[PDB]
Amino acid sequence: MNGTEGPNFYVPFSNKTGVVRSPFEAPQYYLAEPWQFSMLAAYMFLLIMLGFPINFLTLYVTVQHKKLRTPLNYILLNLAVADLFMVFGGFTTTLYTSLHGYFVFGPTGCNLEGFFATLGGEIALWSLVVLAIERYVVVCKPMSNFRFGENHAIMGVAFTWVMALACAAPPLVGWSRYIPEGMQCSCGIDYYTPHEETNNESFVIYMFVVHFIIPLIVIFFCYGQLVFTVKEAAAQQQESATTQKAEKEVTRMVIIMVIAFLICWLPYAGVAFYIFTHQGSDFGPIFMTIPAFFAKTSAVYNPVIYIMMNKQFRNCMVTTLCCGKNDD
Ligand SMILES: *[C@@H]1O[C@H](CO)[C@@H](O[C@@H]2O[C@H](CO)[C@@H](O[C@@H]3O[C@H](CO)[C@@H](O)[C@H](O)[C@@H]3O)[C@H](O)[C@H]2NC(C)=O)[C@H](O)[C@H]1NC(C)=O
Ligand SMILES: *[C@@H]1O[C@H](CO)[C@@H](O[C@@H]2O[C@H](CO)[C@@H](O[C@@H]3O[C@H](CO)[C@@H](O)[C@H](O)[C@@H]3O)[C@H](O)[C@H]2NC(C)=O)[C@H](O)[C@H]1NC(C)=O
Ligand SMILES: CCCCCCCCOCCOCCOCCOCCO
Ligand SMILES: *C/C=C(C)/C=C\C=C(C)\C=C\C1=C(C)CCCC1(C)C
Ligand SMILES: CCCCCCCCCCCC[N+](C)(C)[O-]
Ligand SMILES: [Zn+2]
């Protein structure tokens, strides 16, 4: 056996030397150097100390400024909340797990870490869908005399929560399950075992198809409509050069957010898909540790892209932080 399966775990280390233990029962220092566990800990600590203030700040600045009530403003507020859930719901646990080198909080700890990570990632993915569609509607206005206003914004946000929970929750109640990965200090979906009792196989398929591929199809479609229009379907829409310059700011930003997501999550995606199609194969704990922990920057990069690429949000922020002068 290249790894060590247990009732509820899969250590990617051979147990021929009898050293393997359950990531729920004892430290995993046999897996790698303890200074590496300190690196993860240190890492999570930074993510928490960065993620807590940039998200809250985003959330706070948005609420405080009434003029910040467009679909973008709404979507980014939504991410800010999603990220605070990742930070406080998940990262605190992954931090503490890294410090002890195992899930001292047992499977309940693992569920927290896996849930909020999955939730935050998916909320970001589906939010991208809502934005692309909003860019589509606002930049090409295909449907009739329609208004993607505040009302749809709310419906947009609720929508992201629905899809994301459709992915993150089922493994909490019997469809697949959260399971330790890599050095055993973070938890992901079970790509590792078939465990037919929780119908693992069918969940992983559902996840990759509905919670990765489909959303990418939708965004790709929208991206199609925008390239086309910015080309020859907009010169007939008489888009005044004055609005386009502000609607191109926002369009560029969404595109960057989409690229950042791919940069952040594809590596995890690939390893997961690999493991899934090579169960039992010989891979170490480092194979998934790097992509998994890297993906956790998803809790941080969005508000930063926001601050850096949306002048209106930026100015409001400086205003909030400087009190009065640097508004809404
Ligand atoms: C655990 O990992 C090892 C690799 O580290 C996997 O073992 C590999 O298994 C394949 C078959 O699935 C072996 O291929 C066979 O090679 C012989 C040559 O003697 C050939 O006649 C067969 O037709 C076939 O091609 C491969 O050699 C083997 N690698 C080694 C060196 O062990 C294994 O599948 C993984 N899981 C298990 C079973 O523990
Ligand atoms: C990796 O292999 C090691 C041993 O190579 C596994 O740990 C060992 O597990 C055995 C069987 O559970 C333990 O033996 C116990 O013996 C008493 C006899 O009084 C019996 O009453 C128990 O039911 C049990 O059979 C043994 O203590 C333990 N060895 C130690 C101390 O490490 C280990 O479980 C394997 N990794 C995993 C968790 O898959
Ligand atoms: C230098 C990399 C060459 C190895 C490429 C292997 C391609 C095997 O096709 C499998 C299809 O998987 C999708 C993308 O492939 C990337 C790695 O494949 C591993 C499968 O998870
Ligand atoms: C640090 C902990 C992590 C990364 C735990 C779990 C992550 C997932 C189950 C991720 C799922 C996916 C997302 C969020 C978006 C890209 C596709 C996906 C299905 C791999
Ligand atoms: C539905 C399939 C999606 C798979 C996405 C794959 C992205 C590639 C990322 C690196 C994976 C390569 N590998 C084998 C080292 O894991
Ligand atoms: Zn409306």
Author numbering: 1 to 326, 330 to 331
What did the paper state?
Owing to their importance in many signal transduction pathways, G protein-coupled receptors (GPCRs) are target molecules for important therapeutic compounds. Rhodopsin, one of the visual pigments in the retina, was the first GPCR to have its crystal structure determined. The structures of ground-state bovine rhodopsin and of one of its recombinant mutants (N2C/D282C) have been solved in space group P31 with two molecules in the asymmetric unit. While investigating the nature of this non-isomorphism, it became apparent that the crystal structures could also be described in space group P64 with one molecule in the asymmetric unit.
In the original crystallographic analysis of the ground-state molecule, the choice of space-group symmetry, i.e. trigonal versus hexagonal, was made mostly on the basis of a reduced κ = 60° peak in the native rotation function. After the structure was solved, the original authors revisited the space-group assignment. The possibility of the structure being in space group P62 was considered and rejected. No consideration of P64 is described in the original structure reports. The model refined in P64 was obtained by superposing the two molecules from the P31 asymmetric unit and retaining the solvent, detergent and additive molecules common to both. Translation of the model also was necessary to align the threefold screw axes in the two space groups. The refinement behavior and statistics for both molecules indicate that space group P64 provides an appropriate description of these crystal structures. The protein molecules in each crystal structure are in identical environments (as far as the X-ray experiment is concerned) and not in two different environments as implied by the models in space group P31. The two crystal structures still differ in the packing interactions between helices 5 in neighboring molecules that are now related by crystallographic symmetry operations rather than by noncrystallographic operations in space group P31.
